Design a protein around this nucleic acid. Structure first.
Length: 44
DNA sequence: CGCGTACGTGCGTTTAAGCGGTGCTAGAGCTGTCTACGACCAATTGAGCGGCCTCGGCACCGGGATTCTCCAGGGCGGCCGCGTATAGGGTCGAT
């Protein structure tokens, strides 16, 4: 502190997934199952 | 690589798919009789196939007509450039 000439410089320191993720996971879900996808009564 | 948008994703609203329970009868399926139609055999006959020939419909082509295919050149505008002129500055002479 008594430094008057050339002081010491040192000494101072909702969630939403990205598009395409759910689609691929849905693809995996339907590729594993074999249940019919179109509903029975509207098809009939 | 950049722009623009269409479809993925999430949520609240809304529709009907699914379950299943119940009742009805139409139509599949079974059965029983009776026969009209098809297989099978024999004898006769011409319709269909190999062969043989002749002939013209089309393969081949040279000339002529045409129907595209490509480009090539002339004009016109712009940009650069060599030459001449004109103004400005510097130097020399005179008062």
């Amino acid at each position: 502190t008594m430094q008057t000439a050339r002081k010491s410089t040192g000494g101072k320191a909702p969630h939403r997934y990205r598009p395409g993720t759910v689609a691929l996971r849905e693809i995996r879900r339907y590729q594993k199952s074999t249940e019919l996808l179109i509903r029975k009564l509207p098809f009939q």
